[PDB]
């Protein structure tokens, strides 16, 4: 298991998300679904010129899996996936410059719901999760598990867990007071409100 420190700017972004009083937490799901849609667009684009890019899975979709026993909400996509280098480099984002722009926007009057406009929407997971685990598999690399409970560090390890073929699985270990995001009616409402124009099938699993 390798343990890394977040860059100071990303640790600052995470503590702002965790510590700021902000009631509109539901936007985390829109942000993660948007990230999954972007990853699916990437593998679809590569497949237009190289059909073998889909040998690791032809179906392009997003699954939402609530688990009340484990208190987890998992977002699975069959997108391009991330390499080990992408995971270490802030989950394939330009998070240092994105955080800079987002901070300036907040100081000027913007609110946390605009996070996605700054390319750091993944971190909105911390509005509802005490810990986030990311399992990913890119065609050019092995399957890895990234994990962080914030606190300034994250871990990366080769995942010997259930093989995914290709794509990313974001496992949200929800905060005790955020279990409404495991309720079918609540998830359905959020997807309908914020993710109505996502161009891939979103399947909400039942328990
Ligand atoms: O370069 C890449 C960057 C990101 C990803 C990616 N795939 N699905 C996700 C879900 C997320 O919540 C966050 C990031 C991703 C894939 C490739």
Swiss-Prot record:
Localization of this protein: Nucleus; Cytoplasm; Melanosome; Cell membrane
Residue ranges of the region described as Interaction with NR3C1: 1-207
N6-acetyllysine carried by residues: 42, 68
Highest taxon listed in the record's lineage: Eukaryota
Mod. after translation: ISGylated. S-nitrosylated; negatively regulates the ATPase activity and the activation of eNOS by HSP90AA1.
Residues where ATP binds: 35, 77, 96, 122
Family: Belongs to the heat shock protein 90 family.
Entry domain remark: The TPR repeat-binding motif mediates interaction with TPR repeat-containing proteins like the co-chaperone STUB1.
Subunit structure, as described in the record: Homodimer. Identified in NR3C1/GCR steroid receptor-chaperone complexes formed at least by NR3C1, HSP90AA1 and a variety of proteins containing TPR repeats such as FKBP4, FKBP5, PPID, PPP5C or STIP1. Forms a complex containing HSP90AA1, TSC1 and TSC2; TSC1 is required to recruit TCS2 to the complex. The closed form interacts (via the middle domain and TPR repeat-binding motif) with co-chaperone TSC1 (via C-terminus). Interacts with TOM34. Interacts with TERT; the interaction, together with PTGES3, is required for correct assembly and stabilization of the TERT holoenzyme complex.
Protein name: Heat shock protein HSP 90-alpha
Organism annotation: Homo sapiens
High-level lineage: Eukaryota, Metazoa, Chordata, Craniata, Vertebrata
Parent sequence residues shown: 17 to 223 of 732
